[PDB]
């Protein structure tokens, strides 16, 4: 059981290191990808609106 | 004397040789691969990612023999073939 | 005890592995490939529609 | 005191022995991977913000597809993509599950883990290696022909070196298996050896080793997947 | 003393030698080949497609030497010639 | 004669071989990686920070092996397998 | 104690030395020749046809240093000189 | 025969191996790192002050792989494990 | 404990060491000379004809050192000095 | 059989291994450092006056490591630990 | 048993060690010098003759050491010091 | 079984190890230094005379170490410490 306690503290320090140094940057990367895809969707919608307005102007002339 | 003692001593010497040779191979090969990778990153700072894929392949190969030997070393030291 | 010697587990593991290779090949890779293709098509459509809108505004003003 | 092999839950069926602990660990890893797959099946959204699971799966699929297209065009061998993806995720998940704080003392002085990495068992790595071997050799057979394929592997790139080529072929499966075995087996020893240390000091070496084992397992999964991809590419080189 | 004991110890140490040499050679050779591959891909990432052929010819020769060594070591350890 | 003495002597020799091989591999791999890093920093001091990313990887994949040897050395001299 | 035991042990150790040296030489020489070939092909894609003629010669040399040794190794193990 | 005699003979051989491997690794690694430093300073006489920053790391983590061995060697010969 | 048996075992070990060292030297030297030849041919194809002149010297100076070993290995093995 | 016989035999073997490792390391390190110094002087002869500073830092350290071995080597053969 | 048997077995092993090390050194040095010569001749075809004078010096050193070792090998094998 | 025989065999093996290590170090170091010298003379024939100076310093260090090993080998084999 003593080795169990030792390895429990070992995993405690492992999780501390992870959630302190590795989790922040990887979460940042995932957030960046999420926002990049969201911006791509927004730009697609905006381009669709611009094309619709161009068609409306073509109708105006 | 006990034959098993001689067998065990021979197996321990053999396993030590296995592990030493594997360590030398891994160390030298991985150091050389790292030399290549770091020099490549030095010449093209923006090529970093494109370089990692080949480097790791090399590491793989470079590690393989070493760790393969490690496995065999276990077979030498724990389950000694031919042990009486 | 000569652990390097293979055992019956070899067959069993294969079975289990194949099961995953089913799911991963049936309900993961196909949807992801379709989604990536859809994303590429969406990006191409966005670029082409921006170009088309510029072209058609130019034509409308010229027309 | 430390032991090797000595698998727990060994059971015999049809005169064939099975290391129950390895089967249980493999089943748990498969359950986790399949749960991830289904969680993506019920969450995959093309027109929405990708989910974290979707992000991970797309990253893996894109990486594997890029490797394949670099090696061999996807128009020829699409199945290699799911094959490599499953191999990578499976090995990675098992290796990283190997880090959970499950080690304990058996009251006989010998440490034991509730979860033992399946790669520590020769049967598991041999199964994956031989399955990949059969897969890409069959793909080559289809690509070139039942008679042409053995001829091509015998000749290889240069016919003059006919014998040595054969050796490499026989090395393809073994190198695929043993490597992984070692990379994990050694780990199963490291922690075990650290178990001999007293508890007040065992945490530090164990913590460092397992922290590095995370990256070691990641590298091993990536290497196995990439080498499988490239073996398919080489086999189907028409 | 049993002659088989001395014979087995000699065979085990011989196999240890065989794999130590194989490890050193394979590791260093694969490391050097991988260094060449990494440098080449650093020169021009386009040449990656045309580089993996000679690289794997070299790795095939090196690993063939290593695994011939492994086969002979296996014969030594498990099928020790000259053992009574 | 006490067979355990033969076992311990063989274990000491095997552990010494393991540690010597590990030290050779670690030293030469570290030296090669450091030479590559020094050449890179001499080339472009502007990229001092970036070059560490591969360096520490290489050292990580070399130093690891070193310490692994140490672990098995501890197995051989303190928990000699096959000891009676 | 049968002298054949000592003879066989010495022969096996000698064969192990022979194989270790041959494997090291073959692996490292092949790695270096492959590094040269990879660099050449990376620089000049058209050179792939030209470089094979010299490269294999180098291989034919290192392999000659290898297989020759292997032949003698067989003599050590299967027809041991001085065997009585 | 006194068992401690064989114990200490094996221990001395193991320590010799350990420090020999340490010396090889330290010498070659220091040589390679110094080669990098020399070339860097030769091509950039004013960079010397900065060029020591990485170099000290390399040597810094190389002598360790040497000075660890010394400790272990000091352990083997003086306080030999399992020295009944 | 036939004295001839011990003498022959020692002779076999010595011959194995001779062959191992010779294989090391021959393999590495041939690989390096071939690397130089390949680089030269890749740089300047017309140089091929002239490059074979110095290269054959280098291999001649390498294989010779290896070939000599063969003879002496035979001296050690087939006609053991001080065989008694 | 006098146990001190085995003690001193092991001590001599260990000392020989110490000296062999130290010599390999020192020779190769000095050779590489000298190669660096000579190449740097060839590139820019005027730089020689400055280059001697880093050079002595390398060789001076290498030899130091070598010298360290000698110290312990003496300890092995002159005042052998565990001698009775 | 015969003291001469032990002494001559040790002498033969030592001679094998010396010859193996000498062959390793000679092969490595000859290959490296020949690689330098090959590169120099490829780059500077009209300098062929000029390059022989330095090369022959390098060999003149390397080979020298090897041959010196050879001499001492005979001193071990045909005039074994301490034989009695 | 004269203890002097065991001592002499150990001393001969130790001397063989010393000379092997010295041979390897000297050969490789001198080969590398000669490589540097040949390359420099190929690049800069003007500094050829000036290039000799660092080359001779490097060769003096390498051969100095080699001859120190020679002296210690002479000490071991001819006046073996601990003879009794």
Swiss-Prot record, chain A:
Domain of life: Bacteria
Transmembrane regions listed in the UniProt entry: 3-23
Subcellular location: Cell membrane
Cysteines joined through disulfide linkages: none
Complex and partners: F-type ATPases have 2 components, F(1) - the catalytic core - and F(0) - the membrane proton channel. F(1) has five subunits: alpha(3), beta(3), gamma(1), delta(1), epsilon(1). F(0) has three main subunits: a(1), b(2) and c(10-14). The alpha and beta chains form an alternating ring which encloses part of the gamma chain. F(1) is attached to F(0) by a central stalk formed by the gamma and epsilon chains, while a peripheral stalk is formed by the delta and b chains.
The family this protein is said to belong to: In the N-terminal section; belongs to the ATPase B chain family.
Additional observations: Binds 2-aminothiazole antibiotics, which are antitubercular agents.
Function: F(1)F(0) ATP synthase produces ATP from ADP in the presence of a proton or sodium gradient. F-type ATPases consist of two structural domains, F(1) containing the extramembraneous catalytic core and F(0) containing the membrane proton channel, linked together by a central stalk and a peripheral stalk. During catalysis, ATP synthesis in the catalytic domain of F(1) is coupled via a rotary mechanism of the central stalk subunits to proton translocation. This fusion protein includes a component of the F(0) channel (subunit b) and of the F(1) subunit (subunit delta). Two copies of subunit b and one of delta together form the peripheral 'stator' stalk which links F(1) to F(0).
Protein name: ATP synthase subunit b-delta
Residues included from the entire protein: 1 to 61 of 445
Curated annotation (Swiss-Prot), chain C:
Positions of transmembrane segments: 4-24
Similarity annotation: Belongs to the ATPase B chain family.
Function: F(1)F(0) ATP synthase produces ATP from ADP in the presence of a proton or sodium gradient. F-type ATPases consist of two structural domains, F(1) containing the extramembraneous catalytic core and F(0) containing the membrane proton channel, linked together by a central stalk and a peripheral stalk. During catalysis, ATP synthesis in the catalytic domain of F(1) is coupled via a rotary mechanism of the central stalk subunits to proton translocation. Component of the F(0) channel, it forms part of the peripheral stalk, linking F(1) to F(0).
Segment of the intact protein contained: 22 to 84 of 170
Subunit annotation: F-type ATPases have 2 components, F(1) - the catalytic core - and F(0) - the membrane proton channel. F(1) has five subunits: alpha(3), beta(3), gamma(1), delta(1), epsilon(1). F(0) has three main subunits: a(1), b(2) and c(10-14). The alpha and beta chains form an alternating ring which encloses part of the gamma chain. F(1) is attached to F(0) by a central stalk formed by the gamma and epsilon chains, while a peripheral stalk is formed by the delta and b chains.
Intracellular or extracellular location(s): Cell membrane
Domain of life: Bacteria
Gene from which this protein is expressed: atpF
Protein name: ATP synthase subunit b
């Amino acid at each position: 059981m003593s080795i169990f306690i030792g390895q429990l503290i070992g995993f405690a320090v492992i999780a501390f290191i992870i959630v302190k140094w590795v989790v922040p940057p990887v979460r940042t990367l995932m957030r960046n990808q999420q926002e990049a895809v969201r911006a791509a969707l927004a730009e697609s919608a905006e381009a669709a609106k611009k094309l619709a307005d161009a068609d409306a102007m073509h109708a105006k002339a | 004397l006990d034959p098993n003692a001689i067998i065990t001593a021979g197996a321990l010497i053999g396993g030590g040789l296995i592990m030493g040779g594997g360590a030398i191979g891994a160390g030298i090969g991985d150091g050389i691969a790292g030399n290549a990778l770091i020099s490549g990153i030095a010449r093209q700072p923006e090529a970093q990612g494109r370089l990692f894929t080949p480097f790791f392949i090399t590491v793989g190969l470079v590690e393989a023999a070493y760790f393969i030997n490690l496995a065999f070393m276990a077979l030498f030291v724990f389950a000694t073939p031919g042990l009486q | 005890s000569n652990f390097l010697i293979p055992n019956g587990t070899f067959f069993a593991v294969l079975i289990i592995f194949l099961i995953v290779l089913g799911v991963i090949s049936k309900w993961v890779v196909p949807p992801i490939s379709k989604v990536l293709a859809e994303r590429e098509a969406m990006l191409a459509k966005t670029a082409a529609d921006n170009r088309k809108s510029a072209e058609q505004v130019a034509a409308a003003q010229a027309d | 005191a430390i032991h090797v092999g000595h698998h727990t839950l060994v059971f015999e069926l049809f005169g064939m022995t099975f290391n129950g602990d390895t089967i249980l660990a493999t089943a748990v890893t498969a359950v986790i991977v399949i749960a991830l797959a289904f969680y993506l099946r019920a969450k995959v959204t093309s027109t929405g913000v990708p989910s974290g699971v979707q992000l991970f799966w797309e990253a893996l699929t894109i990486q594997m597809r890029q490797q394949i297209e670099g090696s061999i065009g996807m128009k020829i061998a699409p199945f290699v993509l799911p094959l490599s993806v499953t191999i990578f995720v499976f090995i990675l998940i098992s290796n990283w599950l190997a880090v959970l704080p499950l080690q304990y003392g058996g009251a006989d002085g010998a440490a034991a883990e509730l979860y033992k990495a399946p790669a520590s068992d020769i049967n598991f790595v041999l199964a994956l290696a031989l399955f990949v071997f059969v897969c890409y050799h069959a793909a080559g057979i289809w690509r070139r022909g039942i008679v042409g394929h053995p001829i091509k592997v015998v000749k290889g790139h240069v016919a003059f070196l006919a014998p040595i080529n054969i050796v490499e072929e026989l090395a393809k499966p073994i190198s695929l298996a043993l490597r992984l075995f070692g990379n994990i087996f050694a780990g199963g020893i490291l922690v075990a050896l650290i178990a001999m240390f007293p508890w007040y000091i065992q945490w530090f070496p164990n913590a460092v080793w397992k922290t590095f084992d995370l990256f070691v397992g990641l590298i091993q999964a990536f290497i196995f997947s990439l080498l499988t991809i490239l073996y398919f590419s080489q086999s189907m080189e028409l």
